[PDB]
Design an enzyme around this catalytic site. Sequence first.
Site, mmCIF file in Angstrom:
data_model
loop_
_atom_site.group_PDB
_atom_site.id
_atom_site.type_symbol
_atom_site.label_atom_id
_atom_site.label_comp_id
_atom_site.label_asym_id
_atom_site.label_seq_id
_atom_site.Cartn_x
_atom_site.Cartn_y
_atom_site.Cartn_z
ATOM 1 N N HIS A 85 0.862 -1.182 0.000
ATOM 2 C CA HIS A 85 0.000 0.000 0.000
ATOM 3 C C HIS A 85 0.898 1.232 0.000
ATOM 4 C CE1 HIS A 85 0.329 -0.529 4.420
ATOM 5 N NE2 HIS A 85 0.173 0.780 4.470
ATOM 6 N N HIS A 87 1.652 3.812 2.076
ATOM 7 C CA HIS A 87 2.289 4.508 3.185
ATOM 8 C C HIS A 87 3.809 4.318 3.172
ATOM 9 C CE1 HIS A 87 -1.700 4.594 5.660
ATOM 10 N NE2 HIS A 87 -1.583 5.653 4.884
ATOM 11 N N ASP A 89 5.902 3.126 5.220
ATOM 12 C CA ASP A 89 6.493 1.856 5.623
ATOM 13 C C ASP A 89 6.436 0.809 4.517
ATOM 14 O OD1 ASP A 89 3.688 2.057 6.318
ATOM 15 O OD2 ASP A 89 3.855 0.211 7.487
ATOM 16 N N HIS A 150 -6.923 -1.772 6.400
ATOM 17 C CA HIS A 150 -6.012 -0.772 6.935
ATOM 18 C C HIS A 150 -5.936 0.445 6.017
ATOM 19 C CE1 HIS A 150 -2.397 1.030 8.563
ATOM 20 N NE2 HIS A 150 -1.989 1.103 7.313
ATOM 21 N N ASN A 181 -2.265 2.266 13.241
ATOM 22 C CA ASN A 181 -2.537 3.574 12.657
ATOM 23 C C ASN A 181 -3.726 3.446 11.714
ATOM 24 O OD1 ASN A 181 -2.480 6.160 11.569
ATOM 25 N ND2 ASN A 181 -0.236 6.272 11.719
HETATM 26 C C1 LIG Z 1 3.620 5.335 8.123
HETATM 27 C C2 LIG Z 1 2.423 4.650 8.775
HETATM 28 C C3 LIG Z 1 2.666 4.381 10.280
HETATM 29 C C4 LIG Z 1 3.452 5.225 11.064
HETATM 30 C C5 LIG Z 1 3.635 4.943 12.423
HETATM 31 C C6 LIG Z 1 3.027 3.827 13.004
HETATM 32 C C7 LIG Z 1 2.228 2.974 12.217
HETATM 33 C C8 LIG Z 1 1.475 1.798 12.469
HETATM 34 C C9 LIG Z 1 1.352 1.044 13.817
HETATM 35 C C10 LIG Z 1 1.078 1.720 15.000
HETATM 36 C C11 LIG Z 1 0.988 1.014 16.196
HETATM 37 C C12 LIG Z 1 1.175 -0.367 16.216
HETATM 38 C C13 LIG Z 1 1.076 -1.125 17.564
HETATM 39 S S1 LIG Z 1 -0.632 -1.711 17.875
HETATM 40 C C14 LIG Z 1 -1.237 -2.623 16.410
HETATM 41 O O1 LIG Z 1 -1.522 -0.600 18.232
HETATM 42 O O2 LIG Z 1 -0.704 -2.546 19.080
HETATM 43 C C15 LIG Z 1 1.458 -1.042 15.030
HETATM 44 F F1 LIG Z 1 1.647 -2.398 15.017
HETATM 45 C C16 LIG Z 1 1.549 -0.333 13.836
HETATM 46 C C17 LIG Z 1 0.903 1.444 11.244
HETATM 47 C C18 LIG Z 1 -0.008 0.254 10.952
HETATM 48 O O3 LIG Z 1 -0.803 -0.160 11.840
HETATM 49 O O4 LIG Z 1 0.034 -0.273 9.806
HETATM 50 N N1 LIG Z 1 1.258 2.327 10.329
HETATM 51 C C19 LIG Z 1 2.049 3.262 10.875
HETATM 52 N N2 LIG Z 1 1.232 5.486 8.737
HETATM 53 C C20 LIG Z 1 1.159 6.886 8.781
HETATM 54 C C21 LIG Z 1 -0.232 7.309 8.745
HETATM 55 C C22 LIG Z 1 -0.698 8.784 8.788
HETATM 56 N N3 LIG Z 1 -1.485 9.145 7.602
HETATM 57 C C23 LIG Z 1 -0.723 9.087 6.307
HETATM 58 C C24 LIG Z 1 -1.433 10.403 6.014
HETATM 59 C C25 LIG Z 1 -1.241 11.886 5.597
HETATM 60 N N4 LIG Z 1 -2.209 9.962 4.774
HETATM 61 C C26 LIG Z 1 -1.697 10.630 7.494
HETATM 62 O O5 LIG Z 1 -1.084 6.186 8.703
HETATM 63 C C27 LIG Z 1 -0.182 5.010 8.697
HETATM 64 O O6 LIG Z 1 -0.523 3.873 8.658
HETATM 65 ZN ZN LIG Z 2 1.767 -0.301 8.433
HETATM 66 ZN ZN LIG Z 3 -0.154 1.873 6.412
#
Ligand SMILES: C[C@@H](c1cccc2c(-c3ccc(CS(C)(=O)=O)c(F)c3)c(C(=O)O)[nH]c12)N1CC(CN2CC(C)(N)C2)OC1=O
Ligand SMILES: [Zn+2]
Ligand SMILES: [Zn+2]
Length: 232
Positions: A85, A87, A89, A150, A181
């Site tokens: 996807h 993002h 990562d 997601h 996220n």
């Molecule tokens: C870059 C990415 C991102 C960054 C940092 C963390 C994550 C996490 C994440 C968080 C917590 C846990 C533990 S837990 C499951 O809670 O126990 C975890 F396992 C994964 C995930 C995901 O879950 O995949 N992704 C992250 N980003 C950014 C984003 C913001 N958006 C883009 C925009 C402008 N379009 C605004 O959205 C996103 O996914």
């Molecule tokens: Zn992710």
């Molecule tokens: Zn993502």
Amino acid sequence: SGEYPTVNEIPVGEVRLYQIADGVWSHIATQSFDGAVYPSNGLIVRDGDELLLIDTAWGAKNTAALLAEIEKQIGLPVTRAVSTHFHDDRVGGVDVLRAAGVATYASPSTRRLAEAEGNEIPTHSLEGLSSSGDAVRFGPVELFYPGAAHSTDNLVVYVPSANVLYGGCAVHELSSTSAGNVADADLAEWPTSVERIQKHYPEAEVVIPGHGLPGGLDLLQHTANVVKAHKN
Ligand SMILES: C[C@@H](c1cccc2c(-c3ccc(CS(C)(=O)=O)c(F)c3)c(C(=O)O)[nH]c12)N1CC(CN2CC(C)(N)C2)OC1=O
Ligand SMILES: [Zn+2]
Ligand SMILES: [Zn+2]
């Protein structure tokens, strides 16, 4: 020393690989986002005498270190990469890959979202994945679009030779409490998309989340559970 790596075992700016099955590895890297540190996974699948890469290591320098770790541990060239996807990562590091001669691919939806949001953009469009339930073959894997979860564009990857299901960020690890996220998620559709994954890949033996520890099929139901709870 054999356990699945976490942020606490990966040196700074480093990438680690983990053998999942014959010719299948995950890659694990660490990155900081909004002042917190997170792990993230990708996949490596042997493609004869070449390698297929699934997802970057979340950043240019991490992805350069990923290529160096692949040369050290495997020694076969990465010729193609798929981002699951839009993002960072998943696509952060595509420019590094492209400059290293790797052909980078993603669905047209992922490419459009990456471009709109200012993320790095895979070169080639993967057609045949625009409708939920769609599947296409790509080297040694099958790519599957389960529907919005997601993110609206998230793809999952199946390695039929080893019954490995790489769920990407549409699948969470067992220890997870919330749904990660959810900024771009569809919480209402996510359980239905997970159901599609479960129906399509009932023989999966290993399930790899986008972040955290791999496990078995239980990760799919757990993900649905945490998503419905977050939603509520
Ligand atoms: C870059 C990415 C991102 C960054 C940092 C963390 C994550 C996490 C994440 C968080 C917590 C846990 C533990 S837990 C499951 O809670 O126990 C975890 F396992 C994964 C995930 C995901 O879950 O995949 N992704 C992250 N980003 C950014 C984003 C913001 N958006 C883009 C925009 C402008 N379009 C605004 O959205 C996103 O996914
Ligand atoms: Zn992710
Ligand atoms: Zn993502």
